[PDB]
Design a binder for this molecule. Structure first.
Ligand SMILES: COc1c(C)cnc(Cn2cc(C#CCC(C)(C)O)c3c(Cl)nc(N)nc32)c1C
Length: 214
């Protein structure tokens, strides 16, 4: 009803990127974590910076953090930040619009012998989620907008709806529904090893949750 879903097509360039990400043979999948962590960090930087001018921007939650939560029984890995969040326009229009050129350069660079690990230099690392995820759900809440859920299982489309499930207050929760072959990422020990390798110096506390059972 009010949480009625609308389905949208990805920009052509982004659909091909995502296909390339899903169908290229590439073993170093763990780079997805660096990119999602990097995104969480920039969103937290943004809200911190804006809060300096206008401190009431933190009324929706003072704490600036990242939690990484592996759940084996649901086959999900979640990354939750208390960053700036995304508006409806961001999710439907602006993120796609901005990412076209990065996507097009990335693919050109791949043709010319760059590797998929370099996705972050092109501003489009979010889509490396599909190295490991069959489906990605993003819950997000920006100040003065309402909470939204974005979802996609690739194949060229995404859905956006109002989300009246549990309030996140402010931020983004990226829920990675992992592929059957990628369950190593549902163990804290693996997640820890990847965070130490690639994201040790992030300027926010990253709590790695321990799976309650394997
Ligand atoms: C819907 O899913 C996505 C898609 C399709 C593409 N990219 C991203 C990456 N991304 C982008 C975020 C943003 C923003 C808008 C500004 C920069 C104005 O805050 C943004 C934010 Cl605000 N937070 C996080 N964690 N990631 C973000 C996501 C999550």
């Amino acid at each position: 009803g009010e949480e009625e879903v609308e389905t949208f097509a990805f920009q052509a360039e982004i659909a091909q990127l995502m296909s390339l990400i899903i169908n290229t043979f590439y073993s170093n999948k763990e780079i997805f974590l660096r990119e999602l962590i990097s995104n969480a960090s920039d969103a937290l930087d943004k809200i911190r910076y804006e809060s300096l001018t206008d401190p009431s921007k933190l009324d929706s939650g003072k704490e600036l953090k990242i939690d990484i939560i592996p759940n084996p029984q649901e086959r999900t890995l979640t990354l939750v930040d208390t960053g700036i969040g995304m508006t409806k326009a961001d999710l439907i229009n602006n993120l796609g619009t901005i990412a076209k050129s990065g996507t097009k350069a990335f693919m050109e660079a791949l043709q010319a012998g760059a590797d998929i690990s370099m996705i972050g230099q092109f501003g489009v690392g979010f889509y490396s989620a599909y190295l490991v995820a069959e489906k990605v759900v993003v819950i997000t809440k920006h100040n003065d907008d309402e909470q939204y859920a974005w979802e996609s299982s690739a194949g060229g489309s995404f859905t956006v709806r109002a989300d009246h499930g549990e309030p996140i207050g402010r931020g983004t929760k990226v829920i990675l529904h992992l592929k059957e072959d990628q369950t190593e990422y549902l163990e804290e020990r693996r997640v820890k090893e990847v965070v130490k390798k690639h994201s040790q110096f992030i300027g926010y506390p990253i709590t790695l949750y321990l799976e309650k059972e394997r």
